[PDB]
Design a protein around this ligand. Structure first.
Ligand SMILES: OC[C@H]1O[C@@H](O[C@H]2[C@H](O)[C@@H](O)[C@@H](O)O[C@@H]2CO)[C@H](O)[C@@H](O)[C@H]1O
Ligand SMILES: OC[C@H]1O[C@@H](O[C@H]2[C@H](O)[C@@H](O)[C@@H](O)O[C@@H]2CO)[C@H](O)[C@@H](O)[C@H]1O
Ligand SMILES: OC[C@H]1O[C@@H](O[C@H]2[C@H](O)[C@@H](O)[C@@H](O)O[C@@H]2CO)[C@H](O)[C@@H](O)[C@H]1O
Ligand SMILES: OC[C@H]1O[C@@H](O[C@H]2[C@H](O)[C@@H](O)[C@@H](O)O[C@@H]2CO)[C@H](O)[C@@H](O)[C@H]1O
Ligand SMILES: [Ca+2]
Ligand SMILES: [Ca+2]
Ligand SMILES: [Ca+2]
Ligand SMILES: [Ca+2]
Ligand SMILES: [Mn+2]
Ligand SMILES: [Mn+2]
Ligand SMILES: [Mn+2]
Ligand SMILES: [Mn+2]
Lengths: 232, 232, 232, 232
């Protein structure tokens, strides 16, 4: 089988194994800070530089993957804690949408909320334009920030959140387990045909954004990942 | 919310949080050995002593849970490396089946391979009487060792295996991510309505067994667990 | 290490992790109400259902623990706001003393004030028969409600009180930090050898009581706890 | 009573409430990074700007206090993870020792390891010149980094540690509870006469240092404090 595996307990600007897009910046503590607190409509994204083959066009097999990462979102004086973080999968040539307004687009979609990607969003602001639930939530996104499915969640400022994601190729099931600071877990699963939605080779990464009045600290602390594609 | 969470990096006899059934033994390194290498049809089971309420008859809600554990199976001279380990969920009054023949029953079912439990098996011997695939495998079991679903797997002697399981109550999806020593991951997912198959109060644990000719070292090295039930 | 850890931000009847004894009742808001305002000499106790091994006779080791909890006492019309709440540790077979008169015994001692337990009381009535200080007070109790040591305190009706207790096994020191509604803190420390006073396995819990004329609302709002025993 | 209370969920340079000394720096995420990874023998300290009266020469009373804080230490490529962080109490005019060599001095003692301060150290390097234990450890220091008492500990890279400290004026006991990432707790308590070792007006703060070959990330994430002095 074809396996791609990597582990990051801290990051560094200059590490070729990672693509930095937008306002992303690396702190002296190794944390990746996605958005710039001073910029309006800030958008920052980080992608694993090596594209991953999530499915074979020859066998029709989709890859199974296991990934876990930890992030932290914190409030900053006088700004609404917005808009959130999104773990996404997109075509290998993905870039921040031209003229991105940040905000509820989470840095992965156009103004209508459309884009080419599959991801798990940790949404901390309710955008009625994208049919967001009234509270903070974790959502499964398929080519749109208008979630296919969401579950109520609570974003605690300064809290380190651990997330585990399992994608089972056979069932095409995407399940997420979120471990909040207080020990409680929040889960959400959704069948998503990766081969029908994305190209053979994709890139994995994170993205976050802010608006003029909505800004907060978005940090990726660590990230381990393993994908296995059966080639037979 | 109602959360039960525990983390075992090592075990020690005398700990009231752990119930031992059968040929279980605690090694000095803190590892648990499930079967006795000198006994015919050995069965060993370890359970979290406290019953967990996976669903509420009052709200009809089912709990979501996230658990990861690591184990090791090592061949011993002369015996067939069998029969494996099973991570199961059973009624709180669960006991080793009376007159258990061990072997392919994995210590959780009767001779016909039937019993009251839901589990994830790491089967290393092909029992045709229970329709086992021809190779080592991982399987989702529901009241039977005749798996509802299996996925080809490989048990490497002396290899430390890491497993992560997510049960999403909303979708009733049980997903398993197995990480082999060589970095490759194996996944298997299955929709299982815990509320329909199990009583409100259950116990979680591991069971291993052998036969006269089938014997091998079965080790549980660690186990972390978190279940969250919505009480409103 | 052998660690037992739990966290309760709210409670609900049916959670097997909790044992109720006496007139305990769970409110719709998730709070636990210890006594029944309509019963004479009411006594209500809640205990963590799983026995904890605070010390090993095999190693002579004693565990250290950190626990924090919040409670509230509210006066009711024209009953005496009596008699208080007590956080205690007792043998796992602990039951409300037979023929308990409640009142000043706080639900853990006999009529003479004797019992088998260690605890921290938040006393709101002064029982001369138990040598209570003339005012409300926090006290360290060892097998008796005739506190080994007390510190003046003031129970404010309707006020939420936060408590932090640290037990350092090495020095056998039990220190308590009580944070009042107004912001001030009250502390009390006392060396207590748990190994000498209690058996290896015990239970932690809260007890409250009243009498015929002494009754009030005793509420347990939250409770987090962690103990670690060195097994080596 | 005279009570001083403050709570920081994030810090920032320019906040008059805090004094910065040495190589301290405030990351955009609100975290305080005590040492400079690029400087040899780096020392950074942070203090609550306002001196706190711990004892009174008039009444002879000593204040009790409750304080908890969280920090994080993480390794950096090719540098020994040293030397650690220390929560200290010192005269209101306390300064980084003249000609400090950082390293095992933790930025509070001279070359011989002497200084005017009381503190709890989270020591990650074994300096035999100060009689350190052979492993990472937590220690109570009184005017010397030659801890009056230490307890075995383990500094996990990238893990967020929570510390709770209670000082009971009555028994003059200083007990510390350290909650590790894996949930285990470590405690240490020592009787310390603040009145005899420190002036009436003191300053609380954190200090960390490194050497040429010894460097690591030292972050202070949050800090709440409450001291109450009985003025009668
Ligand atoms: O409050 C945060 C949200 O802001 C929305 O945009 C605001 C913008 O921040 C404000 O300055 C003004 O222009 O009104 C806009 C419309 O609400 C974002 O659209 C939303 O995503 C949040 O970031
Ligand atoms: O070889 C391992 C398998 O043994 C099977 O039982 C054998 C037994 O070991 C042998 O001594 C003889 O009695 O024949 C039995 C039937 O094949 C178990 O049934 C199977 O589960 C494996 O353990
Ligand atoms: O007033 C509260 C105290 O009452 C004492 O008991 C009283 C009882 O309430 C009253 O009805 C009558 O029977 O006299 C008793 C003796 O004083 C309790 O002993 C004390 O603990 C408080 O609850
Ligand atoms: O390795 C960390 C320890 O370093 C010790 O100092 C070293 C110094 O880092 C190195 O450059 C060379 O000069 O040898 C010194 C002697 O060991 C510190 O004394 C110790 O506290 C640690 O930081
Ligand atoms: Ca949104
Ligand atoms: Ca089998
Ligand atoms: Ca009393
Ligand atoms: Ca040192
Ligand atoms: Mn959304
Ligand atoms: Mn099988
Ligand atoms: Mn009393
Ligand atoms: Mn030291």
């Amino acid at each position: 089988a074809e396996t791609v595996s990597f582990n990051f307990n801290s990051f560094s600007e200059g590490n070729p194994a990672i693509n930095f897009q937008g306002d992303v910046t690396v702190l002296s503590n190794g944390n990746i800070q996605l958005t710039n607190l001073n910029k309006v409509n800030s958008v920052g994204r980080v992608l694993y530089a090596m594209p991953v083959r999530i499915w074979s066009s020859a066998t029709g097999n989709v890859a199974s993957f296991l990934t876990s990462f930890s992030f932290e979102m914190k409030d900053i004086k006088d700004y609404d804690p917005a808009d959130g973080i999104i773990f996404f999968i997109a075509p290998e040539d993905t870039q921040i949408p031209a003229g991105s307004i940040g905000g509820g687009t989470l840095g992965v979609s156009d103004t209508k909320g459309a884009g080419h990607f599959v991801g798990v969003e940790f949404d901390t602001y309710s955008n009625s334009e994208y049919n967001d639930p009234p509270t903070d939530h974790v959502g499964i996104d398929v080519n749109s920030v208008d979630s296919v499915k969401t579950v109520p969640w609570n974003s605690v400022s300064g809290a380190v959140v651990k997330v585990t994601v399992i994608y089972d190729s056979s069932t095409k099931t995407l399940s997420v387990a979120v471990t909040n600071d207080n020990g409680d877990i929040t889960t959400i699963a959704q069948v998503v045909d990766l081969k029908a939605k994305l190209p053979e080779r994709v890139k994995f990464g994170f993205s976050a954004s802010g608006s003029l009045g909505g800004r907060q600290i978005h940090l990726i602390r660590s990230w381990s990942f393993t994908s296995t594609l059966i080639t037979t």
